[PDB]
Design an enzyme around this catalytic site. Structure first.
Site, PDB file in Angstrom:
ATOM      1  N   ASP A   1       0.830  -1.188   0.000  1.00 46.42           N
ATOM      2  CA  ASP A   1       0.000   0.000   0.000  1.00 46.42           C
ATOM      3  C   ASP A   1       0.877   1.255   0.000  1.00 46.42           C
ATOM      4  OD1 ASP A   1      -2.081   1.841   0.541  1.00 46.42           O
ATOM      5  OD2 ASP A   1      -2.076   1.339   2.711  1.00 46.42           O
TER       6      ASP A   1
ATOM      7  N   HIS B   1       7.738   3.876   5.990  1.00 43.96           N
ATOM      8  CA  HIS B   1       8.050   3.692   4.578  1.00 43.96           C
ATOM      9  C   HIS B   1       9.164   4.643   4.103  1.00 43.96           C
ATOM     10  CE1 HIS B   1       5.316   1.166   2.412  1.00 43.96           C
ATOM     11  NE2 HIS B   1       4.353   1.542   3.241  1.00 43.96           N
TER      12      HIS B   1
HETATM   13 MG   LIG Z   1      -1.502  -4.198   1.923  1.00 45.25          MG
END
Ligand SMILES: [Mg+2]
Ligand SMILES: [Mg+2]
Ligand SMILES: [Mg+2]
Ligand SMILES: [Mg+2]
Lengths: 1021, 1021
Positions: free
Chosen positions: A199, A355
């Site tokens: 994601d 991230h």
């Molecule tokens: Mg995911």
């Protein structure tokens, strides 16, 4: 000719999971090929290592097939000059896509679509011919997304998959002296893409470093380090295993030395040749050395003690062939009896998932950013981080080793969009591909002390491939536990129960993969593992409600050892408006389809590394010192496991309603896990009415590597006493004067005038002198411009009826109509009294009833009393208050209440009760996606302009109406309204956040009582 | 053009472990694509399945590079017409190589040598166009060694590795109507070769079936079966999971029916779509059915009850799309509490390791051979077999399922020649390649009831790759245990301790991978697993000595559950002499270098499936019935776990020295694991002197599927009594007459004459009438023509000094010189008496001394008495006896002693004491590699011709001298000598066999006493 595109692309390696690389060398820890021991020892730059970063030529195509043969030989005319590393979407070539679960391409493994954005990179460079005579010259790509073919001087060299780990090739035989040319063809989509469904923004290119390494023919090809200790850690053994490549000769030697800075701690020398391992012998080309260390200095996130280790490949005579090195940390990680221990003590993980993201550079990382993150984290009481969800840039590990952060290293595998989730993970055919993703990571990172757990990936369900891999690691590296959440968070493939989004006390019993209350999960029959949430407390927008419930549980249950918040920074990208003005962009802002909008923004900090207010809540709940107050005694408890409080000062202070009566300072002397009693001098006992409060703060007098001097690391406050006011206001010499018209009631008293409209039943205007004070009448408000948590995943096309907002909307909360039931005025002897009653209805149903009284006395004070009734069958309202638009606009806001930052009912522990003064601008929280924000709770007095309000309430104040917030999708589009909008709430609903796709506000924070009462006093100065 | 050799071979896929296949379809159980349920149910041949076996064109080249482009398009002129399947070495193209450990190629992974024997096969065939309109057409190669590229109609199709499992490809898009052409290029060497180092002949080609399969577009792509039971096996659940490929539509259905022959036992029907497995859902394209079965009939090797299961893919209306089927056996295999159980009872494995070998066809297998093996095995009391060391031809499993044999299925991985052994197995880079070798096997074979254990391979040391794979299997197929011997036989990668060649009571403590005495191994601290030897009792040549020690231990210790003998058949190949005469060939016989000579011959049967004598020993020790004799009562115990003795007759018999006095028959009635008492009628009590013996035999009155009527399955014998002879020989009417010459002593008596040479001290000749009886004088013998076990691995270049033979040679046993010490003659009143004494010396040392007396009486009998002394410091001698070459040659041999087959001291339990009569030819054992053979022990009387000998000894008799045997390397080269050679041994050393590369004769069987005495009587009729 076989070097030709037509031939090379024929195979279509990018549509075959059976081919993940071609001609790629083996993985290994990081090499520099020093040729001098001191250089290696001091980490100087090595000359056998060269960067290829800089300007390169680039050209883009819609498909690999469209690349023209010439490219191989000659640069293109239409080629641009671009900086490498970088992500091509960031340069305009194509759009970055923001999709979450759903794959950006069509789901047809292992095929990728025919239109597949190819990026042809090329570079022309010079090779010193010295390198060309002797040794080996290889090229290293730290990261290329998602797949690529490589040519050197027209010659086809190899191919590679896995965007997160280094790809290396031997160039030795393609290099010419002087001028050489690389031609790299990078593909967006590959069979590798099926394993990279995280994601995040979907980007591409040569996003990490490019280098050249010159190594001797006979070299060090790999090395591993390990530390073993005795019962008490008073003695250790460093054990190093080294392997060589090349021509094995008996005069070869290996030496390993360990240094403590300048001091040489231990050394060992030996010739190649291992111990017998099986019926056929041992490894002739390896050797293992063992160094003893007495009273080693242990590494921890609390005190990152490091040592330097040098490995020298040399001849018996003493002539050095090459040297390699690494930082070593002596620590032991183990799970014992249900607990995860570090150096013998049980950890408590204050973590965050992070991230690799830059608002400007996309997925490209740099030292400066990395460090900033580290500092912020450390300063906000975090001690660990999770590489969601792939191996990170190499330097990261080093920084963590040095600064002191625990890290979970995670393989680059996420098949989230499959159905069922484990469609590929349970297939043997995909085993090889998955395998490389784990093995290679381990091979590269295993010597870093900060990596304490290995993770097999993320959201890929649970398949046999996972079990096989879990076991492989366990065999190759027994020094660190392995974890993996997929398929239920407690499978055979994890050493730790590591759910994501499990609640503290509520169970979410989904079929097959339920998420139990974490307290209950531990006690399930036969369960004995520790529990650490891989993700919790979704920080999306105005969130982090309920954070404290977790901390309390973690602190009370031994086997609840913490978790990693989701997540560190917002994944927003910068865009520009016609005036060359930058703004924060999210999913769909690039014409990207399909997209997941704001879902990419879940951080505790804005993309620019500026803090969301939630960060303070985290900081406080994660503090390392805890306090208890008993009488005049403060009891301090340390949650440090290894250090003594040696850079800590305790400041205390007593204040009466904001007024300070006494202050003091005491230095802390607490041993890790100990207590310290602090005796307070006799405290002042004022007569005056008000609340007496004690506040303590812990300060770090001296700077550290991650903090400045005077950093505040913890705080706590207590209400000591209260003296109720038994006083009576003095006589007025006059009383207000009433005036009935047909349209209104008008009360006057001096310069002051108040008008109540007789048809609406609301205070419509008020004057001070000849100056009107309101742009809008004062009225009841029961709704809020929805938060991200209120919305969840409800989309306009695909409505989610459980979302709070959907329920409010549907009940008509947002469109209910006020109806005047009664509006009377009376003259008392000391004042004027107005009474109103209104009902809000919607389609026949009476949702709420509001009854008030306004009493204006001879002192010019207006006292308001509100009593509301809420139909038990209407969804609990977001709030119960009043609002109005004031005409005035001032600079500052001053209040006596909780602050100074934005706080909500389920997010207010970090806030302190005092007297605050800020600029109006600070009372607004610029969430990229706008909503209700800026609230401050437990307020007793609020001052703005000539106005003053008193009571016990919560409020917000800004230039944007709730309606505007709710109707504007991006912060950059909001426009300041005419005056100041003020929202005074008697009560307000919590914000939630256990997750952002289901109702997450706990019951204790819902306005479910049915009847509410509140009161205020409004006056002017 | 990209279809061109020049392009295709450019990649060099055969020198890359990263490419193990290209375009290969997935593995699955066996499919036929029936289009009619009954056909499937009755196993009829399906028409969607077609064989391509037969004549094909073939051509050979030294290297892939030498293949000419035309080949692709057009058959070659020089191409031969050959039968497929086959191994090209068997047709003359190149030589088969017989190397054991040492790789046939140079060790340089992953490179193969440049001269790499390429075999271009091609075939032209016709496709029905019906197949061409609808569906899918694939080609299947059951086995191709070692790697290959494939083209169809000029078009490049794919590539494959792993010589032991099927490779499948979709031909659908390359097929033309009518005439098509396949061009298969097969390579000898590939990177796959590094994983195929089994000890066997190294061959190549398309050695297993070639087929075409026509399947519907929407088909059954896979299916698995599983059986679960209740506590007592009175109730079961068959659970089938089916997966489909194609176009998923809601009208699809699946039906599963279970049949018991003709009767339909259960059925179930359902539509696609599984249960939720994770957050993303379930498998829409699978469905699992569960059938209940009451009182199922269990499968076992004792009673292979099978059921038939049919899987039909059909539409809701009832229209059948396709059907697949399989035989199902209900059994449960589990390890519990240290024991391996089958259906709840602990097994006792009577196993054998078996390679796929044909003296004529090489590695090509066929039904007829397979069945023969099975029959023989079953008839010799074996109940299990191990697929040493790769998946076998598909039909094998089926045969075992049907006949009833337990099978261990083993992955095709052996890296024996690496150094250390786990050099590749511990490398992640080789993980993918290894993986395919395991996964694919499991996928194919897992529905067969006879497979009860999975094996990860053989002699590949122990590496992490193994652990990972062991775990994968455990997750995917929990119904069968996993085993793997490498790296010590007790690693984490095995559920069973499965050593090879561990001894019963002696430990062999090699470093790192010691082999403990199996009794001790079980008791090691913390050990709890069962122990089953993966290989034991090396049957090379005259071997199997000590077999009984194992059986006794297995029977006494619960956790010792048996083993697999090494091995079934000799791996000898047929060759021809100039007269078109065939002979048995072994390593080096084909000019093959490097080679391991006889090492390829270790079987219990000759390549032709004719038995070595050792087979009887096995048969007896493995018998399923055991006996105890108490008084007149025989106690029978059954070792069957599931069947009752329902086809068994017990025959008994009493004999006095070979003479039968009483016989009887009794039928057995023993329950599995029970006892039966058999009361014997009063036994005869002869007065006559001699030994009374009781013998029992178990006979199978009725034929079975693997045996004929009257098969003997067990026996046992006991000595009941003995009446010593107190008799005196009667008077002679004369006494011999002596005559001294200078040269000799000559005794005469009637026609009879005996002569003793005075210089040698030996009986030099003897006459009956005027007929000389000896061609050689009678003399002491202390050596034997060495057995394979006596030699071990001693080679002439590389001598192994511990080998018995090396020690005998070096001590001079073979070249010691007799020296006469004394030779006297005297006349007594009743006879003539000769006395001699000789010493054997060698280089000053007296090795042995032999003192005798010969006494010739008036009855013409010569009694010999021998007393030997052996220097305690000389290696124990192979034997202590006499020999001579008789002039005569007769037809039969008759004796009273153990027999009838060849028996040695440590291999004689299966032999029986009786009176035997055989043809001379039967007293010789034609071991391909010649040595001492043919012995029979415990002999009391021997008759040959006019001669008769009595005593207590062992002997052998044939036309070959020990010297000839020892000097001739192949049986086909022996030539019958002039008369008959006779060896009469007072004592003989055991033969050993625990292994064939170390001294394996137990101490109790070595001639270590120092002093030996024996006596005989020689006479004529
Ligand atoms: Mg995911
Ligand atoms: Mg690929
Ligand atoms: Mg290959
Ligand atoms: Mg071997």
């Amino acid at each position: 000719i076989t070097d030709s595109l037509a031939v090379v692309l024929q195979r279509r390696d990018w549509e075959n999971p059976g081919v993940t690389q071609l001609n790629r060398l083996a993985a290994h820890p990081p090499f520099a090929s020093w040729r001098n021991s001191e250089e290696a020892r001091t980490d100087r730059p090595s000359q056998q290592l060269r960067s290829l970063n800089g300007e390169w030529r680039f050209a883009w195509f819609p498909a690999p097939e469209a690349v023209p043969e010439s490219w191989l030989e000659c640069d293109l005319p239409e080629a641009d000059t671009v900086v490498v590393p970088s992500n091509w979407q960031m340069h305009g070539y194509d759009a970055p896509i923001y999709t979450n679960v759903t794959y950006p391409i069509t789901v047809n493994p292992p095929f990728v679509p025919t239109e597949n954005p190819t990026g042809c990179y090329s570079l022309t460079f010079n090779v010193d011919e010295s390198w060309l005579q002797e040794g080996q010259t290889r090229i290293i790509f730290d990261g290329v997304n998602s797949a690529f073919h490589l040519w050197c001087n027209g010659r086809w060299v190899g191919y590679g998959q896995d965007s997160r780990l280094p790809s290396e090739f031997d160039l030795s035989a393609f290099l010419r002296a002087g001028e050489n040319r690389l031609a790299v063809m990078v593909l967006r989509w590959s069979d590798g893409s099926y394993l990279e469904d995280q994601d995040m923004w979907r980007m591409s290119g040569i996003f990490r470093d490019v280098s050249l390494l010159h190594k001797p023919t006979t070299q060090i090809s790999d090395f591993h380090v390990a530390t073993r200790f005795n019962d008490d850690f008073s003695r250790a053994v460093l054990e190093a295993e080294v392997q060589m490549c090349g021509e094995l000769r008996d005069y070869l030697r290996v030496t390993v030395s360990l240094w403590q800075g300048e001091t040489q701690v231990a050394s060992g020398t030996a010739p190649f040749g291992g111990e017998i391992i099986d019926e056929r012998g041992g490894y002739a080309d390896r050797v293992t050395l063992r160094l003893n260390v007495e009273n080693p200095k242990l590494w921890s996130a609390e005190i990152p003690n490091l040592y330097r280790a040098v490995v020298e490949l040399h001849t018996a005579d003493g002539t050095l062939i090459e040297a390699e090195a690494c930082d070593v940390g002596f620590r032991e990680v183990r799970i014992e009896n249900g607990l995860l221990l570090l150096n013998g003590k049980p950890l408590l993980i204050r973590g965050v998932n992070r991230h690799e993201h830059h608002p400007l550079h996309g997925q490209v990382m740099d030292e400066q950013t990395m460090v900033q993150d580290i500092l912020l984290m450390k300063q906000n009481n975090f001690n660990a981080v999770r590489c969601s969800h792939y191996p990170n840039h190499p330097l990261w590990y080093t920084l963590c080793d040095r600064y002191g952060l625990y890290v979970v290293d995670e393989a680059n595998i996420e098949t989230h969009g499959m159905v069922p989730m484990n469609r590929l993970t349970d297939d043997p055919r995909w085993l090889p591909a998955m395998s490389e993703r784990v093995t290679r990571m381990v091979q590269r990172d295993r010597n870093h002390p900060s990596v304490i757990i290995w993770s097999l990936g993320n959201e890929s369900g649970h398949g046999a491939n996972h079990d096989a891999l879990y076991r492989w690691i366990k065999s190759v590296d027994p020094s660190r536990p392995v974890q993996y959440e997929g398929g239920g968070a407690d499978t055979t493939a994890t050493d730790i129960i590591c759910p994501m989004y499990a609640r503290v006390d509520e169970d979410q019993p989904f079929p097959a993969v339920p998420k139990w209350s974490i307290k209950k999960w531990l006690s399930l029959p036969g369960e004995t593992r520790p529990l650490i949430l891989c993700e919790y407390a979704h920080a999306m927008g105005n969130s982090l409600g309920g954070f404290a419930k977790y901390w309390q549980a973690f602190r009370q249950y031994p086997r609840l050892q913490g978790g990693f918040v989701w997540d560190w920074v917002d994944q927003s990208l910068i865009k520009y408006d016609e005036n060359g003005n930058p703004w924060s962009a999210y999913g769909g802002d690039f014409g990207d389809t399909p997209n997941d909008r704001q879902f990419c923004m879940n951080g505790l900090v804005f993309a620019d590394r500026t803090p969301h207010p939630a960060l303070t809540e985290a900081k406080h709940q994660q503090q390392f010192f805890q306090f208890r107050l008993s009488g005049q005694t403060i009891e301090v408890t340390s949650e440090y496991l290894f250090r003594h409080s040696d850079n800590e000062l305790l400041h205390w202070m007593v204040a009466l309603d904001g007024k300070p009566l006494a202050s003091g300072e005491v230095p802390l002397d607490v041993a890790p896990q100990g207590k310290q009693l602090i005796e307070l001098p006799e405290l002042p006992q004022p007569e005056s009415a008000g609340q007496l409060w004690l506040t303590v703060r812990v300060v770090q007098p001296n700077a550290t590597a991650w903090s400045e001097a005077g950093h505040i690391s913890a705080w706590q406050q207590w209400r000591l006493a209260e003296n109720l006011s038994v006083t009576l206001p003095a006589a007025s010499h006059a009383i207000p004067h009433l005036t009935t018209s047909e349209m209104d009631f008008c009360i006057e008293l001096g310069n002051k005038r108040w008008q109540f409209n007789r048809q609406s039943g609301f205070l419509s205007q008020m004057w001070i002198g000849d100056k009107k004070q309101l742009l809008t009448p004062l009225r009841d408000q029961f709704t809020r411009a929805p938060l991200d948590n209120d919305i969840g995943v409800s989309e306009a096309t695909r409505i989610d009826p459980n979302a709070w907002v959907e329920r409010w909307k549907a009940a008509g909360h947002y469109q209910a109509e006020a109806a005047l039931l009664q509006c009377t005025a009376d003259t008392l002897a000391d004042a004027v009294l107005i009474t109103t009653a209104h009902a809000w209805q919607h389609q026949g149903k009476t949702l709420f009833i509001s009854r008030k009284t306004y009493r204006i006395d001879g002192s010019g004070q207006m006292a308001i009393t509100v009593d509301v009734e809420v139909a038990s069958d209407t969804p609990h309202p977001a709030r119960i208050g009043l609002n109005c638009q004031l005409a005035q606009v001032a600079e500052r806001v001053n209040w006596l209440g909780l602050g100074p930052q934005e706080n909500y009912p389920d997010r207010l522990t970090a806030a302190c009760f005092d007297r605050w003064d800020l600029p109006l601008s600070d009372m607004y929280t610029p969430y990229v996606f706008p909503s209700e924000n800026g609230l401050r709770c437990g307020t007793r007095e609020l001052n703005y302009g000539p106005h003053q309000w008193r009571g016990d309430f919560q409020f917000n104040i800004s230039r944007y109406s709730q309606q505007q917030l709710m109707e504007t999708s991006h912060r950059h589009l909001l426009h300041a309204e005419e005056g100041t909008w003020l929202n005074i709430d008697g009560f307000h609903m919590g914000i939630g956040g256990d997750d952002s796709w289901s109702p997450s506000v706990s019951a204790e924070f819902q306005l479910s009582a049915g009847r509410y009462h509140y009161q205020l006093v409004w006056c002017q100065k």
